[PDB]
Amino acid sequence: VEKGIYQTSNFRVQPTESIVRFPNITNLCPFGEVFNATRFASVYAWNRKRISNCVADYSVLYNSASFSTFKCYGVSPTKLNDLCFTNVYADSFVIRGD
Amino acid sequence: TESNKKFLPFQQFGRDIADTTDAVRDPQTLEILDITPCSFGGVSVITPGTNTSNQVAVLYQDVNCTEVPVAIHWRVYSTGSNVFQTRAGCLIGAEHVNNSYECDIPIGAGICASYQTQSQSIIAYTMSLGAENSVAYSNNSIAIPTNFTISVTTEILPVSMTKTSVDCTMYICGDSTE
Amino acid sequence: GAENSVAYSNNSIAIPTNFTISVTTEILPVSMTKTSVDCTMYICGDSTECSNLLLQYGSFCTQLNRALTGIAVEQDKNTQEVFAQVKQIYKTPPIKDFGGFNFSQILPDPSKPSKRSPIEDLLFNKVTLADAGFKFNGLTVLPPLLTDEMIAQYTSALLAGTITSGWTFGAGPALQIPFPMQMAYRFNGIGVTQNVLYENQKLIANQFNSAIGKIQDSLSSTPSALGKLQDVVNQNAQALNTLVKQLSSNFGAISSVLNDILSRLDPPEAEVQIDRLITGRLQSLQTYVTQQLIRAAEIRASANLAATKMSECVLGQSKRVDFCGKGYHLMSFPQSAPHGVVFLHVTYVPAQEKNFTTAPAICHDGKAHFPREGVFVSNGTHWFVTQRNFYEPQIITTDNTFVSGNCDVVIGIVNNTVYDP
Amino acid sequence: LGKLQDVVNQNAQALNTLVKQLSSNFGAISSVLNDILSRLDPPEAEVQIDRLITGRLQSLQTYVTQQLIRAAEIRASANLAATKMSECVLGQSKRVDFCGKGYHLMSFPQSAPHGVVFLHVTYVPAQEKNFTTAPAICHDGKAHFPREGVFVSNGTHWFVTQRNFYEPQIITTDNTFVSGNCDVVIGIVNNTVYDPLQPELDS
Ligand SMILES: *[C@@H]1O[C@H](CO)[C@@H](O)[C@H](O)[C@H]1NC(C)=O
Ligand SMILES: *[C@@H]1O[C@H](CO)[C@@H](O)[C@H](O)[C@H]1NC(C)=O
Ligand SMILES: *[C@@H]1O[C@H](CO)[C@@H](O)[C@H](O)[C@H]1NC(C)=O
Ligand SMILES: *[C@@H]1O[C@H](CO)[C@@H](O)[C@H](O)[C@H]1NC(C)=O
Ligand SMILES: *[C@@H]1O[C@H](CO)[C@@H](O)[C@H](O)[C@H]1NC(C)=O
Ligand SMILES: *[C@@H]1O[C@H](CO)[C@@H](O)[C@H](O)[C@H]1NC(C)=O
Ligand SMILES: *[C@@H]1O[C@H](CO)[C@@H](O)[C@H](O)[C@H]1NC(C)=O
Ligand SMILES: *[C@@H]1O[C@H](CO)[C@@H](O)[C@H](O)[C@H]1NC(C)=O
Ligand SMILES: *[C@@H]1O[C@H](CO)[C@@H](O)[C@H](O)[C@H]1NC(C)=O
Ligand SMILES: *[C@@H]1O[C@H](CO)[C@@H](O)[C@H](O)[C@H]1NC(C)=O
Ligand SMILES: *[C@@H]1O[C@H](CO)[C@@H](O)[C@H](O)[C@H]1NC(C)=O
Ligand SMILES: *[C@@H]1O[C@H](CO)[C@@H](O)[C@H](O)[C@H]1NC(C)=O
Ligand SMILES: *[C@@H]1O[C@H](CO)[C@@H](O)[C@H](O)[C@H]1NC(C)=O
Ligand SMILES: *[C@@H]1O[C@H](CO)[C@@H](O)[C@H](O)[C@H]1NC(C)=O
């Protein structure tokens, strides 16, 4: 290295501790109740249910892998448990396999 | 930090020009919090030629000398024991001086460094424009030279550079048909 | 422009009677802000996944940083090629007698905390640094080497060696000389004999003083005077703003915030989204750097002319036309402005014209006579040889004229009597 | 010889960088075209090769743009060397600090790898001595100004001397010219101006 002043890199201070804040609601979201319905509505008239003011244990739902295909096109299933949502709407109906 | 944003009842997050969040409202307590990135800055190593020595100084650009020890690039590098302040930043490993010399390694903001012997150390000082001078002006006084000198001074200039040709197809594909 | 005509006639000349001393300002840029960007922080914003993905693209980052560092060093070179032409630092004498001339407006003012001159104060107020725009996103601004008080010292050393030394302090050891004697040589430089000054010293001094005074009013009245420097600032600040806004664009990704993409999706699907942002931001950085390279080339081309006007007009009288002032150049003074330099070119301009009949020879006794230095002109009854640029008749004698040939060969020769001293 | 040397490095370094750009994935599975071709069929090899093509095309564009800017910079110095040759070498230059620091006398060219070296010869005054000067000289009710030179006195006598090499000369009429009457110029001083013609008439 020849005489001079060289910009080797940039320094960033490191975090000390992690702090997490979440709205806490005693109610647990009735996700199971949506799938517990004895009879689903007709396909031409699908049923819509809104879920709010509760805590959703997506981890339990995912681990309770009773579903064949469970894919989310805008989110990853693993990240769902940590992530939080504002408005949740479940649309239930019946279709064909194809 | 605590802030004076004055959020509206239906408003949750602030925003920045670059679409980066810079204000929130704690969900549990409705107090308004202002978010700031943690301190950062470039690090510049001032070094004499490795042939001359292997001792160097470190400049933290526009950072507080009180905060430099908190920084993580490594080595503490004798923080506190040898610290100098300047408008460019905090300089560590350099010894201040009151004499003014010519500039050798320009640190900036008028501060220039050098590697002097006194057995050697890096000294950071204020560069000198030149030797002070004065002219004895007087409305009836002139000065006429009595002797001269012939001086030959060199002047170097570029006039051209290498003529290079690159074959696009050979470079990109390397003689492959696909 | 206004229609005009010249009453051309093959035996008609016009020799001006009075003159004027006019001080005209000229503004030049000399450097630009020394911005410096950190590729990795800008593109990735301190995320490990993005930082790893950015490694595949090669050494774009290092060759962006090399270009920006080259520009930054060029700026410090430009700021020093202009002002640092003086070997030493001179000091103006405590006594201010200069034969009538008044430099109080240009020389340093001791009263102020900084040794600026009043005109320098006006210039620094008009072009307010960081007037427009100028940033946690890896963009930083480095300080110039010369602290803006060393620039004042340089422009005062130049201006205090010009007053007492003249053109000599730039070509050897500075030699003192009274100012009213220096102007008598600046006058010979333009083809006007020296006696024109000493005889009209008082009027010339007052014209110079008033001309200097009007500069402050002209600068104060119009805010756009220094626009040429101001534009530079804007062109830089504007650019930076654009670059920053480029961080809010999707470029095709689901979102423009890296954290949201990372938290929504796992790496297997987040790689595709992040790659588009990396490509877009890399393209934006390349655009910014190329524009800065071209703009810096332009500024360098202007610094190379500022450093030439400093050498040929501040440190000596210039014979080039319309190079240093509109008129016949007499001298020049520098002033420092934010990111630039302002010259005050002093020039001589003839004012009042009167026309006569002129003949190119004088057949005294069969031998033509041509004037050594002057023009033959007659008011109708007598013939006089007059210097070209200031009407001053003088009886014709052998000292002003030299003989070459016979009378029949020439065209337009006219009879007359040439006195014999 | 830094300047010339610098040029070479600026070019060489660039080339090196360009060559190294051939070892980068740019997102492809490999940076070697042969490996991609020999491990994958064209239907899947097209996707991989497109990224390498885009990356290398971008690198070539970067190189060419940098070379264009650098060539403009070099042309700006060729156009100044071609002016120094025209005005310094082929004639004497009156421009200040153009053909060397001092009063220019001549110059000599020399070739160097990718450049030219001038040897500007210049004149510089060395030793200074100061005197008392007066703008005019009132012989008898007539101001006298020096035709070419400046008045200076060593304390007892007045001499008109050229302004760049001290050389006193007795003041006479031939090197001074008259304009007006005394008492109109500040600083005029009494003195006697010799008459070259008078002694001959007396003789
Ligand atoms: C959260 O917990 C706190 C505990 O102090 C409680 O006061 C608050 O009502 C809870 N609600 C939300 C929405 O966070
Ligand atoms: C550091 O911050 C202090 C105030 O806490 C300030 O006075 C000083 O100028 C800052 N910069 C330094 C110490 O380099
Ligand atoms: C430099 O001068 C300052 C006062 O101007 C003084 O406090 C300091 O001790 C001096 N340092 C040296 C090394 O002489
Ligand atoms: C002028 O300078 C030369 C060179 O140094 C010296 O030899 C000479 O004596 C000086 N004086 C003259 C030439 O009167
Ligand atoms: C000569 O002309 C100038 C410039 O127009 C004027 O100011 C001056 O009064 C005129 N008369 C003189 C100098 O005697
Ligand atoms: C002109 O000179 C006088 C006397 O030195 C001084 O008082 C004055 O400030 C100078 N300039 C102006 C614009 O008044
Ligand atoms: C002299 O100038 C006047 C205007 O000042 C003009 O009217 C006149 O025609 C001119 N005379 C000649 C002979 O050119
Ligand atoms: C021309 O000037 C001379 C100067 O001696 C004067 O005698 C003469 O009257 C003038 N002629 C005219 C026509 O003005
Ligand atoms: C000037 O033009 C006139 C027009 O009548 C002509 O007679 C005369 O010869 C010309 N004189 C010169 C000196 O050209
Ligand atoms: C001058 O006078 C002579 C006669 O003395 C005459 O022939 C001649 O034409 C006159 N002028 C010129 C310019 O020839
Ligand atoms: C002449 O120059 C000397 C230095 O060479 C200086 O000390 C002295 O004051 C000057 N004399 C005059 C009368 O200007
Ligand atoms: C000035 O020079 C003259 C030249 O004749 C000489 O006679 C005289 O002594 C000198 N005076 C001094 C004071 O050196
Ligand atoms: C020069 O300045 C002195 C200072 O005492 C003054 O007396 C004298 O009149 C001035 N002379 C000239 C020619 O300016
Ligand atoms: C010259 O001498 C005369 C006669 O004593 C005197 O009136 C005058 O003031 C002196 N000075 C000048 C510059 O003429």
Coordinates of all heavy atoms in Angstrom, one line a residue, chain B residues 139-162 164 166-168 171-174 176 178, chain D residues 3-4 11 18 22 33 37 56 63 67 71 84 114-127 129-132 152 161 165-166:
Chain B
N139 N 4.7 55.5 -1.7 CA 4.3 56.2 -2.9 C 5.4 56.9 -3.7 O 5.2 57.5 -4.7 CB 3.3 57.3 -2.5 CG 3.8 58.3 -1.5 OD1 4.5 57.9 -0.6 ND2 3.4 59.5 -1.7
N140 N 6.7 56.8 -3.2 CA 7.8 57.2 -4.0 C 9.0 56.2 -3.7 O 10.1 56.6 -3.3 CB 8.3 58.6 -3.6 CG 8.7 58.8 -2.2 OD1 8.0 59.3 -1.4 ND2 9.9 58.3 -1.9
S141 N 8.7 54.9 -4.0 CA 9.8 53.9 -3.8 C 9.6 52.8 -4.9 O 8.5 52.3 -5.0 CB 9.7 53.3 -2.4 OG 10.6 52.2 -2.3
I142 N 10.6 52.5 -5.6 CA 10.6 51.5 -6.7 C 11.7 50.5 -6.4 O 12.7 50.8 -5.7 CB 10.6 52.1 -8.1 CG1 10.1 51.0 -9.1 CG2 12.0 52.5 -8.5 CD1 9.9 51.5 -10.5
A143 N 11.7 49.4 -7.1 CA 12.7 48.3 -7.0 C 13.0 47.8 -8.3 O 12.1 47.2 -9.0 CB 12.3 47.2 -6.0
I144 N 14.3 47.9 -8.8 CA 14.7 47.5 -10.1 C 15.7 46.4 -10.1 O 16.8 46.6 -9.5 CB 15.2 48.7 -10.9 CG1 14.1 49.8 -11.0 CG2 15.7 48.3 -12.3 CD1 14.5 51.0 -11.9
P145 N 15.4 45.2 -10.6 CA 16.4 44.1 -10.5 C 17.7 44.5 -11.2 O 17.8 45.2 -12.2 CB 15.7 43.0 -11.3 CG 14.3 43.2 -11.1 CD 14.2 44.7 -11.2
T146 N 18.8 44.0 -10.6 CA 20.2 44.2 -11.1 C 20.8 43.0 -11.8 O 21.8 43.1 -12.4 CB 21.1 44.7 -10.0 OG1 21.1 43.7 -9.0 CG2 20.6 46.0 -9.4
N147 N 20.2 41.8 -11.6 CA 20.8 40.6 -12.1 C 19.7 39.6 -12.4 O 18.6 39.7 -11.8 CB 21.8 40.0 -11.1 CG 22.9 39.2 -11.8 OD1 22.8 38.8 -13.0 ND2 23.9 38.8 -11.0
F148 N 19.9 38.7 -13.3 CA 18.9 37.8 -13.8 C 19.2 36.3 -13.7 O 20.3 36.0 -13.1 CB 18.5 38.1 -15.3 CG 19.7 38.0 -16.2 CD1 20.2 36.8 -16.6 CD2 20.3 39.2 -16.7 CE1 21.3 36.8 -17.4 CE2 21.3 39.1 -17.6 CZ 21.8 37.9 -17.9
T149 N 18.4 35.4 -14.2 CA 18.7 34.0 -14.2 C 17.9 33.4 -15.4 O 16.8 33.8 -15.7 CB 18.2 33.4 -12.9 OG1 19.0 33.9 -11.8 CG2 18.4 31.9 -12.9
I150 N 18.5 32.3 -15.9 CA 17.9 31.5 -17.0 C 17.5 30.2 -16.4 O 18.4 29.5 -15.8 CB 18.8 31.3 -18.2 CG1 19.3 32.7 -18.7 CG2 18.1 30.6 -19.3 CD1 18.3 33.6 -19.2
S151 N 16.2 29.8 -16.4 CA 15.7 28.6 -15.8 C 15.0 27.7 -16.8 O 14.1 28.2 -17.5 CB 14.9 28.9 -14.6 OG 13.7 29.6 -14.9
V152 N 15.3 26.5 -16.8 CA 14.6 25.5 -17.7 C 13.7 24.6 -16.8 O 14.2 23.9 -16.0 CB 15.7 24.6 -18.5 CG1 15.0 23.7 -19.4 CG2 16.6 25.5 -19.2
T153 N 12.4 24.7 -17.1 CA 11.5 23.9 -16.3 C 10.8 22.9 -17.2 O 10.4 23.3 -18.4 CB 10.4 24.9 -15.7 OG1 9.7 25.5 -16.7 CG2 11.1 25.9 -14.8
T154 N 10.6 21.7 -16.8 CA 9.9 20.7 -17.6 C 8.4 20.8 -17.5 O 7.9 21.3 -16.5 CB 10.4 19.3 -17.1 OG1 11.8 19.3 -16.9 CG2 10.1 18.3 -18.2
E155 N 7.7 20.3 -18.5 CA 6.3 20.2 -18.5 C 5.8 19.0 -19.3 O 6.1 18.9 -20.5 CB 5.6 21.5 -19.1 CG 4.1 21.4 -19.1 CD 3.5 22.6 -19.8 OE1 4.3 23.4 -20.3 OE2 2.3 22.8 -19.6
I156 N 5.2 18.1 -18.6 CA 4.7 16.8 -19.2 C 3.3 16.9 -19.6 O 2.5 17.6 -18.9 CB 5.0 15.6 -18.2 CG1 6.5 15.3 -18.1 CG2 4.2 14.4 -18.7 CD1 7.2 16.3 -17.1
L157 N 2.9 16.3 -20.7 CA 1.5 16.3 -21.2 C 1.2 14.9 -21.9 O 2.0 14.4 -22.6 CB 1.3 17.4 -22.2 CG 1.0 18.8 -21.6 CD1 1.2 19.8 -22.7 CD2 -0.3 18.9 -21.0
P158 N 0.1 14.3 -21.6 CA -0.4 13.2 -22.4 C -0.9 13.7 -23.7 O -1.2 14.9 -23.9 CB -1.6 12.7 -21.6 CG -1.4 13.1 -20.2 CD -0.7 14.5 -20.3
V159 N -0.8 12.8 -24.7 CA -1.2 13.1 -26.1 C -2.1 12.0 -26.7 O -2.7 12.3 -27.7 CB 0.0 13.4 -26.9 CG1 -0.3 13.5 -28.4 CG2 0.7 14.7 -26.5
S160 N -2.1 10.8 -26.1 CA -2.9 9.8 -26.7 C -2.8 8.6 -25.7 O -2.0 8.5 -24.8 CB -2.4 9.3 -28.1 OG -1.1 8.9 -28.0
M161 N -3.7 7.6 -25.9 CA -3.8 6.4 -25.1 C -3.8 5.2 -26.0 O -4.0 5.3 -27.2 CB -5.0 6.4 -24.2 CG -6.3 6.6 -24.8 SD -7.6 6.7 -23.7 CE -9.0 6.4 -24.7
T162 N -3.7 4.0 -25.4 CA -3.6 2.8 -26.2 C -4.9 2.6 -27.0 O -6.0 2.9 -26.6 CB -3.4 1.6 -25.3 OG1 -2.2 1.8 -24.5 CG2 -3.2 0.3 -26.1
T164 N -7.3 0.1 -28.3 CA -7.8 -1.2 -28.0 C -9.0 -1.5 -28.8 O -9.9 -0.6 -29.0 CB -8.1 -1.4 -26.5 OG1 -9.2 -0.6 -26.1 CG2 -6.8 -1.0 -25.7
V166 N -12.2 -4.5 -29.0 CA -12.8 -5.6 -28.3 C -13.9 -6.2 -29.3 O -14.7 -5.4 -29.9 CB -13.5 -5.2 -27.0 CG1 -14.2 -6.4 -26.4 CG2 -12.4 -4.7 -26.0
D167 N -13.8 -7.5 -29.5 CA -14.8 -8.1 -30.4 C -16.0 -8.6 -29.6 O -15.9 -9.5 -28.8 CB -14.1 -9.3 -31.1 CG -15.1 -10.0 -32.1 OD1 -15.7 -9.3 -32.9 OD2 -15.3 -11.3 -31.9
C168 N -17.1 -7.9 -29.8 CA -18.3 -8.1 -28.9 C -18.6 -9.6 -28.8 O -18.8 -10.2 -27.8 CB -19.4 -7.3 -29.4 SG -20.4 -8.2 -30.6
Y171 N -16.2 -11.9 -27.0 CA -16.1 -11.7 -25.6 C -17.4 -12.3 -24.9 O -17.3 -13.0 -24.0 CB -16.0 -10.2 -25.3 CG -16.1 -9.8 -23.9 CD1 -15.0 -9.6 -23.1 CD2 -17.3 -9.6 -23.3 CE1 -15.0 -9.3 -21.8 CE2 -17.4 -9.3 -22.0 CZ -16.3 -9.1 -21.2 OH -16.4 -8.7 -19.9
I172 N -18.6 -12.0 -25.5 CA -19.8 -12.3 -24.8 C -20.1 -13.8 -24.9 O -20.4 -14.5 -23.9 CB -21.0 -11.5 -25.4 CG1 -20.8 -10.0 -25.1 CG2 -22.3 -12.0 -24.8 CD1 -21.7 -9.1 -26.0
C173 N -20.0 -14.4 -26.1 CA -20.3 -15.8 -26.3 C -19.2 -16.7 -26.4 O -19.4 -17.9 -26.1 CB -21.1 -15.9 -27.6 SG -22.8 -15.2 -27.6
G174 N -18.0 -16.2 -26.7 CA -16.8 -17.1 -26.7 C -16.9 -18.2 -27.7 O -16.5 -19.4 -27.4
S176 N -19.6 -19.8 -29.3 CA -20.6 -20.8 -29.1 C -21.8 -20.5 -30.0 O -22.2 -19.3 -30.0 CB -21.0 -20.8 -27.6 OG -22.0 -21.8 -27.4
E178 N -25.1 -21.5 -29.9 CA -26.3 -21.2 -29.2 C -26.3 -19.7 -28.7 O -27.3 -19.0 -28.9 CB -26.6 -22.1 -28.0 CG -26.6 -23.6 -28.4 CD -25.3 -24.2 -28.5 OE1 -24.3 -23.5 -28.6 OE2 -25.2 -25.5 -28.4
Chain D
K3 N 2.3 11.8 -14.7 CA 1.1 12.0 -15.5 C 1.0 10.9 -16.6 O 0.1 10.2 -16.6 CB 1.2 13.4 -16.2 CG 1.0 14.6 -15.2 CD 1.0 15.9 -16.0 CE 1.0 17.1 -15.0 NZ 1.0 18.4 -15.7
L4 N 2.0 10.9 -17.5 CA 2.0 9.8 -18.5 C 1.8 8.4 -17.8 O 0.9 7.7 -18.2 CB 3.3 9.8 -19.3 CG 3.8 11.2 -19.8 CD1 5.1 11.0 -20.5 CD2 2.8 11.8 -20.6
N11 N -5.8 2.9 -18.1 CA -6.2 2.0 -19.1 C -6.1 0.5 -18.7 O -7.1 -0.2 -18.7 CB -5.4 2.2 -20.4 CG -5.6 3.7 -20.9 OD1 -6.6 4.3 -20.7 ND2 -4.5 4.2 -21.5
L18 N -12.5 -5.6 -16.8 CA -13.3 -6.2 -17.8 C -13.1 -7.7 -17.9 O -14.1 -8.5 -17.8 CB -13.1 -5.5 -19.2 CG -13.9 -6.0 -20.4 CD1 -15.4 -6.0 -20.0 CD2 -13.6 -5.2 -21.6
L22 N -15.7 -11.8 -16.5 CA -16.1 -13.1 -17.1 C -16.2 -14.2 -16.1 O -16.6 -15.4 -16.5 CB -15.1 -13.5 -18.2 CG -14.9 -12.5 -19.3 CD1 -13.8 -12.9 -20.3 CD2 -16.2 -12.4 -20.1
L33 N -19.6 -20.9 -19.9 CA -20.7 -21.3 -20.9 C -20.6 -22.7 -21.3 O -21.7 -23.4 -21.4 CB -20.5 -20.4 -22.2 CG -21.7 -19.8 -22.8 CD1 -22.5 -18.9 -21.9 CD2 -21.4 -19.1 -24.1
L37 N -23.8 -25.4 -21.1 CA -24.2 -26.1 -22.3 C -24.2 -27.6 -22.2 O -25.1 -28.3 -22.6 CB -23.4 -25.6 -23.5 CG -23.6 -24.2 -23.9 CD1 -22.6 -23.8 -25.0 CD2 -25.0 -23.9 -24.4
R56 N -22.8 -9.5 -19.3 CA -21.6 -9.2 -20.1 C -21.9 -8.0 -21.0 O -21.0 -7.2 -21.2 CB -21.1 -10.4 -20.8 CG -20.5 -11.4 -19.9 CD -20.2 -12.7 -20.7 NE -19.7 -13.8 -19.8 CZ -19.5 -15.0 -20.1 NH1 -19.8 -15.4 -21.4 NH2 -19.1 -15.9 -19.3
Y63 N -17.7 -0.3 -19.9 CA -16.3 -0.1 -20.3 C -16.2 0.9 -21.5 O -15.4 1.8 -21.4 CB -15.7 -1.4 -20.8 CG -14.4 -1.3 -21.5 CD1 -13.3 -0.9 -20.8 CD2 -14.3 -1.6 -22.8 CE1 -12.0 -0.8 -21.5 CE2 -13.1 -1.5 -23.5 CZ -12.0 -1.1 -22.8 OH -10.7 -1.0 -23.4
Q67 N -14.4 4.6 -21.5 CA -13.4 4.9 -22.4 C -13.7 6.2 -23.2 O -12.8 7.0 -23.6 CB -13.2 3.8 -23.4 CG -12.4 2.6 -22.8 CD -11.0 3.0 -22.5 OE1 -10.3 3.6 -23.3 NE2 -10.5 2.6 -21.3
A71 N -11.3 9.3 -23.3 CA -10.8 9.8 -24.5 C -11.1 11.3 -24.7 O -10.2 12.0 -25.3 CB -11.4 9.0 -25.7
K84 N 0.6 24.5 -27.4 CA 1.9 24.8 -26.8 C 3.0 24.6 -27.9 O 4.0 25.4 -27.9 CB 2.2 23.8 -25.7 CG 1.3 23.9 -24.5 CD 2.0 24.6 -23.3 CE 1.1 24.6 -22.1 NZ 1.7 25.4 -21.0
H114 N 3.4 7.9 -25.2 CA 2.0 8.4 -25.1 C 2.0 9.8 -24.6 O 1.0 10.2 -23.9 CB 1.1 7.5 -24.2 CG 1.0 6.1 -24.7 ND1 0.6 5.1 -23.9 CD2 1.3 5.6 -25.9 CE1 0.6 4.0 -24.6 NE2 1.0 4.2 -25.8
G115 N 3.0 10.7 -25.0 CA 3.0 12.0 -24.5 C 4.1 12.8 -25.0 O 5.0 12.3 -25.7
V116 N 4.2 14.1 -24.5 CA 5.2 15.0 -25.0 C 5.7 15.8 -23.8 O 4.9 16.2 -22.9 CB 4.7 15.9 -26.1 CG1 3.6 16.8 -25.6 CG2 5.8 16.7 -26.7
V117 N 7.0 16.1 -23.8 CA 7.6 16.8 -22.7 C 8.3 18.1 -23.2 O 9.1 18.0 -24.1 CB 8.7 15.9 -22.0 CG1 9.4 16.7 -20.9 CG2 8.0 14.7 -21.4
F118 N 7.9 19.2 -22.7 CA 8.4 20.5 -23.1 C 9.4 20.9 -22.1 O 9.3 20.7 -20.9 CB 7.4 21.6 -23.3 CG 6.3 21.3 -24.3 CD1 5.2 20.6 -24.0 CD2 6.5 21.6 -25.7 CE1 4.2 20.3 -24.9 CE2 5.6 21.3 -26.6 CZ 4.4 20.7 -26.2
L119 N 10.5 21.6 -22.5 CA 11.5 22.2 -21.7 C 11.5 23.7 -21.8 O 12.2 24.3 -22.6 CB 12.9 21.6 -22.0 CG 13.1 20.1 -22.1 CD1 14.5 19.8 -22.4 CD2 12.6 19.4 -20.9
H120 N 10.6 24.3 -21.1 CA 10.4 25.8 -21.2 C 11.5 26.5 -20.6 O 11.9 26.3 -19.5 CB 9.1 26.2 -20.6 CG 7.9 25.4 -21.1 ND1 7.5 25.3 -22.4 CD2 6.9 24.7 -20.4 CE1 6.4 24.6 -22.5 NE2 6.0 24.2 -21.3
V121 N 12.2 27.3 -21.5 CA 13.3 28.2 -21.0 C 12.7 29.6 -20.7 O 12.0 30.2 -21.5 CB 14.4 28.3 -22.1 CG1 15.6 29.0 -21.5 CG2 14.8 26.9 -22.6
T122 N 13.1 30.1 -19.5 CA 12.5 31.3 -19.0 C 13.5 32.2 -18.4 O 14.5 31.7 -17.9 CB 11.3 31.0 -18.0 OG1 11.8 30.2 -16.9 CG2 10.2 30.2 -18.7
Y123 N 13.2 33.5 -18.4 CA 14.1 34.5 -17.8 C 13.4 35.0 -16.5 O 12.2 35.2 -16.4 CB 14.2 35.7 -18.8 CG 14.8 36.9 -18.2 CD1 16.1 37.3 -18.4 CD2 14.0 37.8 -17.5 CE1 16.6 38.4 -17.9 CE2 14.5 39.0 -17.0 CZ 15.8 39.3 -17.2 OH 16.3 40.5 -16.7
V124 N 14.2 35.1 -15.4 CA 13.7 35.5 -14.1 C 14.7 36.4 -13.4 O 15.8 36.1 -13.2 CB 13.5 34.2 -13.2 CG1 12.9 34.6 -11.9 CG2 12.6 33.2 -13.9
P125 N 14.2 37.7 -13.0 CA 15.1 38.5 -12.3 C 15.5 38.0 -10.9 O 14.7 37.3 -10.3 CB 14.3 39.9 -12.2 CG 12.9 39.5 -12.4 CD 12.9 38.3 -13.3
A126 N 16.7 38.3 -10.5 CA 17.2 37.7 -9.3 C 17.4 38.6 -8.1 O 16.8 38.4 -7.0 CB 18.5 36.9 -9.6
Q127 N 18.3 39.6 -8.2 CA 18.7 40.5 -7.1 C 18.1 41.8 -7.3 O 18.1 42.4 -8.4 CB 20.2 40.6 -7.1 CG 21.0 39.3 -7.0 CD 22.4 39.4 -7.2 OE1 23.0 40.5 -7.3 NE2 23.2 38.3 -7.2
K129 N 17.3 45.9 -5.9 CA 17.7 47.1 -5.2 C 16.7 48.2 -5.5 O 16.3 48.3 -6.7 CB 19.1 47.5 -5.6 CG 20.2 46.6 -5.1 CD 21.6 47.0 -5.5 CE 22.7 46.1 -4.9 NZ 22.5 44.7 -5.3
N130 N 16.4 49.0 -4.5 CA 15.3 49.9 -4.6 C 15.8 51.4 -4.5 O 16.9 51.7 -3.9 CB 14.3 49.7 -3.5 CG 14.9 49.4 -2.2 OD1 16.1 49.7 -2.0 ND2 14.1 48.8 -1.3
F131 N 15.0 52.3 -5.1 CA 15.4 53.7 -5.3 C 14.2 54.5 -5.1 O 13.1 54.0 -4.9 CB 16.0 53.9 -6.7 CG 17.0 52.9 -7.1 CD1 16.6 51.6 -7.5 CD2 18.4 53.1 -7.1 CE1 17.5 50.7 -7.9 CE2 19.3 52.2 -7.5 CZ 18.8 51.0 -7.9
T132 N 14.3 55.8 -5.3 CA 13.3 56.8 -5.2 C 12.9 57.2 -6.6 O 13.8 57.5 -7.4 CB 13.7 58.0 -4.4 OG1 14.0 57.6 -3.1 CG2 12.6 59.1 -4.3
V152 N 14.7 57.0 -11.7 CA 15.2 56.5 -10.4 C 16.4 57.3 -10.0 O 17.2 57.7 -10.9 CB 15.5 55.0 -10.4 CG1 14.2 54.1 -10.6 CG2 16.5 54.7 -11.5
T161 N 16.1 54.5 -16.4 CA 16.6 53.1 -16.7 C 15.4 52.2 -17.1 O 14.3 52.4 -16.7 CB 17.2 52.6 -15.4 OG1 17.9 51.4 -15.8 CG2 16.2 52.2 -14.4
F165 N 16.1 45.5 -16.0 CA 17.5 45.2 -15.8 C 18.2 46.5 -15.4 O 18.4 47.3 -16.4 CB 18.1 44.5 -17.0 CG 19.6 44.1 -16.8 CD1 19.8 42.9 -16.1 CD2 20.6 44.8 -17.3 CE1 21.1 42.5 -15.9 CE2 21.9 44.4 -17.1 CZ 22.2 43.2 -16.4
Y166 N 18.5 46.7 -14.2 CA 19.1 48.0 -13.8 C 20.2 48.5 -14.7 O 21.2 47.7 -14.8 CB 19.5 47.9 -12.3 CG 20.1 49.2 -11.8 CD1 19.3 50.4 -11.7 CD2 21.4 49.3 -11.4 CE1 19.8 51.6 -11.2 CE2 21.9 50.5 -10.9 CZ 21.1 51.6 -10.8 OH 21.6 52.8 -10.3

